[PDB]
Paper text:
The carboxypeptidase TAFIa (activated thrombin activatable fibrinolysis inhibitor) is a central player in fibrinolysis. TAFIa removes carboxy-terminal lysines and arginines from partially degraded fibrin. Carboxypeptidase B (CPB) was used instead of TAFIa for practical reasons, since TAFIa was found to be highly unstable with a half-life of approximately 2h at 22 °C30. CPB, on the other hand, is stable and highly homologous to TAFIa with 48% sequence identity.
The known anabaenopeptins B, C, and F (1, 2 and 3) were isolated from a culture of the cyanobacterium Planktothrix rubescens and tested for their inhibitory activity against TAFIa in an enzymatic assay. Compounds 1–3 turned out to be potent inhibitors of TAFIa with IC50 values of 1.5, 1.9 and 1.5 nM, respectively. The comparison of 17, 3 and 14, which only differ in their R1 residues, demonstrated that Lys or Arg side chains were associated with high potency (IC50 values of 2.1 and 1.5 nM, respectively), while the Tyr residue led to a decline of activity by two orders of magnitudes (IC50 of 400 nM). In addition, we obtained crystal structures of the complexes of anabaenopeptin B (1), anabaenopeptin C (2) and anabaenopeptin F (3) with the surrogate protease carboxypeptidase B (CPB). We used CPB crystals grown in the presence of ε-caproic acid with space group P32, since these crystals had wide solvent channels, which allowed the soaking-in of large inhibitors like the anabaenopeptins. After soaking, the crystals diffracted to 2.0–2.3 Å, enabling the calculation of detailed and accurate electron density maps. The general binding modes of 1–3 were found to be very similar and in the following discussion the complex with 2 is used as an example. The linear part of the anabaenopeptins, which mimics the carboxy-terminus of the TAFIa substrate fibrin, deeply penetrated the active site channel and bound in the carboxylate- and specificity-pockets, while the circular parts of the anabaenopeptins were positioned in the entrance of the channel and completely blocked the channel like a plug, thereby preventing other molecules from entering it. All hydrogen bond donor and acceptor atoms of 2 interacted either with hydrogen bond donor/acceptors from the protein, or with bound water molecules. We found that the C-terminal arginine or lysine side chain (R1 in Fig. 3) bound in the S1’ binding pocket and interacted with the side chains of Asp255 and Ser207. The R1 residue was bound in the S1’ pocket, which is specific for basic residues like arginine and lysine in TAFIa and CPB, while the S1’ pocket of CPA is specific for large apolar residues like phenylalanine and isoleucine.
Author numbering:
A (entry chain F): 2 to 6
B (entry chain A): 6 to 188, 188A, 189 to 308
Write the structure that this text describes.
């Protein structure tokens, strides 16, 4: 859920 | 009021934990495993028909504040458990033979903040020495290669790893509960969005778990069961190569404690809506996820 992966 | 079909705020979720336990004392009991930075109660629902010395499966939701379908699913799971028990033979066997520890919201403080101030908040809401920047990424704060890769030492970053491992009340509380219950917890499941993935260790390093082949076949089979409903396509594999390297995650940590079945679930979708999944998609997402969760439960049960 890290942007923007 | 509370609906399983909509996103509920913390006040409603907290009241729901008391109410659903209250309506189903035969299948549910509630405790807290700790409090959050801001003094909210981290509730844990023990779902099952009580018996001596039962094995358990642990599942949490709401690690990351903005991933609202995660919270939604834990509530859905609990209701489905109480609804189908005695009506659906698998779930009935599950609740009879083991317990589910369902932790509906871990990062309560961040969750409230997504409702009150900033819908895209991710981290906890704790203060940091030497800066005004707020919060630690709880899934970078576990003692697993802690802060060595894919994490930030900058408190202003959304993957900030904390001042030390378990520096956060919420993560220390989760780690404490799992240690203290190690001998009964047989699987660890942590619910996230979005990406449509099932991930297992490792993420803090490129190495593979000794039961890598087992974990990969179980993920594979789980993804298949999930697809049967609506054809939603999931991908699977070791966190490090499947999405990215990231240290300090709870799945890796749980696995290294000796829990052989450890999975991060990334639910819908793949980006069209992302974190802001429309409520009209809650039921479908949860239903298909149930099949994956139940498949894993069944597998764990025949591999005690
Ligand atoms: Zn997440």
């Amino acid at each position: 859920x890290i942007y923007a992966f | 009021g509370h609906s399983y079909e909509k996103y509920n705020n913390w006040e409603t979720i907290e009241a729901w934990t008391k109410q659903v336990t209250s309506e189903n004392p035969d299948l549910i009991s509630r405790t807290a495993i700790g409090t959050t930075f801001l003094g909210n109660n981290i509730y844990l629902l023990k779902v099952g028909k009580p018996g001596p010395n039962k094995p358990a499966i642990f599942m949490d939701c709401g690690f990351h504040a903005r991933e609202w379908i995660s919270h939604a699913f834990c509530q859905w799971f609990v209701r489905e458990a109480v609804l189908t028990y005695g009506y659906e033979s698998h779930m009935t066997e599950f609740l009879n033979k083991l317990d589910f520890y369902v932790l509906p919201v871990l990062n309560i403080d961040g969750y409230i903040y997504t409702w009150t101030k900033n819908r895209m908040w991710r981290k906890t809401r704790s203060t940091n020495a030497g800066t005004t920047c707020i919060g630690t990424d709880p899934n970078r704060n576990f003692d697993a290669g802690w802060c060595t890769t894919g994490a930030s030492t900058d408190p202003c970053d959304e993957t900030y790893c904390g001042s030390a491992a378990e520096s956060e009340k919420e993560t220390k509380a989760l780690a404490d509960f799992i240690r203290n219950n190690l001998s009964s917890i047989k699987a660890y499941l942590t619910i996230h969005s979005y990406s449509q993935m099932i991930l297992y260790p490792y993420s803090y390093d490129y190495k593979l778990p000794e039961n890598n082949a087992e974990l990969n076949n179980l993920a594979k089979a789980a993804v298949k069961e999930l697809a049967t409903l609506y054809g939603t396509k999931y991908t699977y594999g070791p966190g490090a190569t499947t999405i990215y390297p990231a240290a300090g995650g709870s799945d890796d940590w749980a696995y290294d404690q000796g829990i052989k079945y450890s999975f991060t679930f990334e639910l819908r979708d793949k980006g069209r809506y992302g974190f802001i999944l429309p409520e009209s998609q809650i039921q479908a997402t949860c239903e298909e996820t149930m099949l994956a969760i139940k498949y894993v439960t069944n597998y764990v049960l025949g591999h005690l």
